[PDB]
């Protein structure tokens, strides 16, 4: 018969300084930390693959 | 006492297909035919420099 602890869940940092525990949940509420202006995709493959 | 021909300016090229002389109007006006989302730079330097 033994005891078992339990340790508190952490926390991530995102936008606005806010803070949760899935990151799920941060990124549709708040943000993400630094932001971008947009990502410039390069394709490689079949035309198929790019379709 | 001899001749001379003139040549016609060239016109360069730009966003909706607009023809224009001077790069700096039609840039003005129509602008660049690419879309970049934006421009993230990385300064070198004394903070002075940065500053």
Request: glycine letters at 4%; aromatic letters at 0%; one cysteine or more.
């Given at each position: 018969m033994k005891?078992?602890?339990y340790i508190?869940?952490?926390k991530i940092l995102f936008a606005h300084g806010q803070k949760?525990?899935?990151?799920?949940?941060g990124?549709?509420?708040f943000g993400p930390?630094?932001?971008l202006y947009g990502i410039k995709s390069?394709?490689?493959g079949?035309?198929?693959g790019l379709k």
């Open positions: 005891e078992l602890i508190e869940e952490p949760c525990t899935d990151a799920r949940d990124l549709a509420l930390l630094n932001n390069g394709v490689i079949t035309k198929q």
